Design a protein around this ligand. Structure first.
Ligand SMILES: *C/C=C1/C(=C/C2=NC(=C\c3[nH]c(/C=C4/NC(=O)C(C=C)=C4C)c(C)c3CCC(=O)O)/C(CCC(=O)O)=C2C)NC(=O)[C@H]1C
Ligand SMILES: *C/C=C1/C(=C/C2=NC(=C\c3[nH]c(/C=C4/NC(=O)C(C=C)=C4C)c(C)c3CCC(=O)O)/C(CCC(=O)O)=C2C)NC(=O)[C@H]1C
Lengths: 491, 491
């Protein structure tokens, strides 16, 4: 039994059911015996009675079982064998994998597509992208145009597991989710684990009748682990979510960057839709290449950002050599440091005087902030995205400054360069329809984009966009530059 | 009791003794009572009998104890108070710290030096260094010339904890240790922990008589933790080591880069030598600035290396667009990839054919290597610095190729770009005297640079310089570039 109270701990990897667009035979480690089969094995393969306790060759044939064994010898990465013939001539696309010393064989009614042909075209059209923004924009349009889904989204995962819709291609009539966030809880840990293990996740029909796997549990009290099975059935919580959205079918492509789940390319259809194995092989290869190219572009962006910071700081050090009074130069220049680190406001606290630029806390609030920084900084870069958690009084000015990064600019005195960010809801660029409502099921309106967004908004109240690893790395380089030149000018 | 069998686990933080160039009073958390004192407190401070069980004001005076309390209010970072007067007029330099709710007060006969003055001069002469090599070279000469020690060394710690002498300034008559390594065991874990906690480590006189702390253990069976005490006595294992080398005095400055112990600036003197507190304050500030500047230069070098790799790969991709046959271009070009990653040889394994450049394994050995790579690679970058640990047969050609980094250049076929490194002893640039022998003590010749070096050499037999994080990051960018263009050219 699963509901909104325990769906975070739902064992979605052992659901005991498969999707009706194919049938599944479980065999022992060596493909000698048939241990489990799907109820619909009879209909598709055209066999009669129980398949459990029979031998692999008896059910499939000496010819086919020979090919399956040889594919298995040349890891849990499933082998894809299109257009395989049974004993009685019938044609099937077959997914073959071994996991927990159990051989799983998945059967699909068989296509004349070239997997590498489709993929090469798609991969050529993204390979020449020169920015993350250009890669992400074109990929949704390209995937929508090639695979013909009603909506293609890209989610990027935030540090706190939350998802942001960073790109969208859709039918004109459908409502936009572009710039909308969902909370971490909308994709449980076990789901993220499976997204990390399988490139593709197919849902052919949300309204389809799930086919049970017999037996559900074996003699030793073990369920069949469907972690790597493409026919694995979906959570009824997600089923209701898609039904509430008017979504009948989905295909997710996992984006792996630096061996972490960066996000998903997700294709939604308003009517039932399953792609054939050859199209799924193409889409998987496209996914791998999309992931690799994004990785290199992310790396390039980082290098460019850090180089820009070094250039800007060298420019400043050149000026600092010529000016006699360093404090005068900082008072004149501090706003220019806003270029180094993305921020909504910057400030200088020097000789117990304050100078502000952009969205900063109010004048009266600063001496408090400066003392707090002095106490916790310990002559190192200090940063928080949640200022009110550190200073409850800061709650009052969170709309203007919810996050703060502090850079010490003197080894001796308690002088600081302060960077500020508004609370994240202030910087929202959401292209969705707020009047658009959603039909609900038994589980309630929790399973609607509208409530998902509302819950995320509540979870980031009085919080700013967190300071990235790059932001802190640049802050540290700036600290060393300013502390160094301050020492050269000291007496 | 400590010897060569248990000196790796020697509790050097609780030795029960101090060095004779100062005296130490331990007080309670609030500096109300005197719990422990050094035997030589009587001589230096000019007091009589036992100081333990007396009150702080009774022993030092209401005036001095007031100043010590107020310094303590404005963390375990010791406060440095030069030229402090006792009740009876006598002048002392005082180190004051609180650790494990115990107040430790260290007394030195008092100097008229300006700490910031000395430091500013030294720090100005290193601030303008534009390479790690230029910073490291000039620092040994500069420190030798300023602080007047017979020898100044910089050790850089290898991944395996081993130390390399990367810079040296010495008296002409002394033997050079430049390019020499010492094994990780020559500096135990507890010693590295204290080097990380204290910027400076002083040894005034290796032949000096250690002054005991009374009581050594208190009523509750607790020793005095001297972790942050500058007067803390040194291990008799290290004492014998310095004696064997002809070293009477030492001062180490800790190099902290990215919150890790990068290495030590170490000053050796052939006669006893203690610097006054003001000179030690200057040397500590110089240490902090040396560490910060090295951090930024390390960061710059990394950026330049990765940028150079991106430029080189863009150049290659431009060529790959114009050539019809990609395999011909790789056969013509592969040696040029030697510029991306430091290596002694590079090779191409394409269509079951081998092409070698520089120090590679012999022709006959390659098919074996290629199969092994194919089995473990899993279409990812594979690297080892110890090839014989992976392939025992590789032992035979270790002098030529002890380390290997493998880059897959095809998503489909098992084609590889292979980078090789000779075993590390082949690339030694040691400037030392091999005929130079050393006097030994009871503990044996283990405590000699000669045996230290010999032990390190044995520990890295059949091993190459390990592949850095930067080497792997570039290998991964190269993989994506080559796999990408190979896909564009596939059929
Ligand atoms: C407590 C458990 C919940 C839950 C579980 C699951 N979610 C799964 C998939 C899923 N969920 C979302 C969330 C969305 N939020 C939106 O606002 C929105 C649309 C605008 C969506 C789609 C996403 C994005 C996904 C990924 C797939 C997709 O995008 O279609 C999931 C796994 C499904 C599977 O087996 O493939 C589980 C389990 N979702 C909840 O909301 C809660 C309550
Ligand atoms: C089993 C314990 C051993 C041990 C302990 C300690 N070593 C400490 C300091 C130390 N040791 C070395 C090693 C050197 N190897 C050389 O070849 C060489 C000279 C060319 C040296 C100096 C170094 C470099 C150091 C750092 C200080 C310095 O360079 O002078 C040590 C701490 C000392 C302290 O309390 O300050 C301990 C403890 N050393 C061994 O060799 C072994 C057996």
């Amino acid at each position: 039994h699963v509901d909104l109270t325990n769906c975070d701990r739902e064992p979605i990897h052992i659901p005991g059911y498969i999707q009706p667009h194919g049938c599944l035979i479980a065999c022992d480690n060596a493909m000698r015996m048939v241990l489990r089969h799907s109820e619909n094995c009879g209909e598709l393969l055209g066999l009669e009675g129980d398949l459990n306790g029979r031998t692999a060759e008896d059910v499939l044939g000496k010819r086919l079982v020979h090919d399956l064994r040889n594919a298995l010898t040349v890891t849990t990465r499933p082998a894809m064998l299109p257009a395989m013939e049974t004993s009685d001539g019938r044609s099937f696309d077959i997914s073959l994998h071994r996991y927990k010393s159990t051989t799983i064989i998945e059967f699909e009614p068989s296509s004349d597509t070239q997997p590498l042909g489709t993929a090469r075209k798609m991969v050529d059209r993204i390979r020449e992208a020169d920015s993350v923004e250009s890669l992400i924009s074109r990929t949704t349009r390209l995937v929508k145009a090639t695979l013909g889904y009603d909506r293609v989204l890209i989610y990027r995962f935030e540090e706190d597991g939350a998802g942001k819709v960073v790109s969208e291609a859709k039918q004109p009539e459908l409502e936009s989710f572009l710039g909308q966030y969902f909370p971490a809880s909308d994709i449980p840990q076990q789901a993220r684990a499976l997204y990390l293990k399988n490139t593709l996740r197919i849902i052919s029909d949300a309204s389809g009748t799930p086919i049970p796997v017999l037996p559900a549990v074996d003699v030793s009290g073990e369920p069949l682990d469907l972690s790597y099975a493409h026919l694995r059935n979906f959570s009824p919580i997600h089923c209701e979510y898609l039904r509430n959205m008017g979504v009948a079918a989905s295909m997710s492509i996992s984006v792996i960057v630096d061996d972490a789940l960066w996000g998903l390319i997700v294709c939604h259809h308003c009517s039932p839709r399953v792609l054939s194995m050859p199209v799924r092989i193409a889409a998987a290869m496209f996914g791998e290449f999309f992931s690799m190219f994004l990785q290199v572009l992310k790396q390039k962006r980082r290098l460019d950002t850090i180089n820009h910071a070094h250039a800007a700081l060298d420019r400043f050090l050149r000026l600092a050599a010529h000016r006699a009074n360093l404090e005068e130069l900082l008072v004149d220049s501090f706003q220019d440091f806003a270029r180094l680190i993305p921020c909504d406001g910057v400030g200088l606290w020097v000789g117990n005087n304050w100078h502000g630029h952009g969205a900063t806390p109010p004048h009266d609030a600063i001496p408090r902030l400066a003392r707090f920084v002095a106490s916790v900084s310990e002559g190192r870069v200090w940063a928080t995205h949640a200022l009110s958690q550190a200073i409850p009084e800061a709650e009052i000015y969170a709309d203007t400054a919810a996050g703060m990064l502090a850079i010490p600019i003197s080894q001796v005195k308690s002088d600081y360069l302060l960077f500020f960010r508004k609370e994240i809801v202030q910087n929202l660029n959401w292209a969705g329809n707020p009047e658009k409502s959603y039909e609900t099921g038994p589980m309630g309106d929790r399973l609607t984009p509208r409530k998902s967004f509302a819950i995320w908004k509540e979870s980031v109240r009085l919080q700013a966009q967190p300071w990235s690893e790059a932001d802190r790395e640049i802050a540290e380089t700036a600290r060393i530059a300013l502390v160094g030149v301050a020492f050269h000018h000291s007496e």
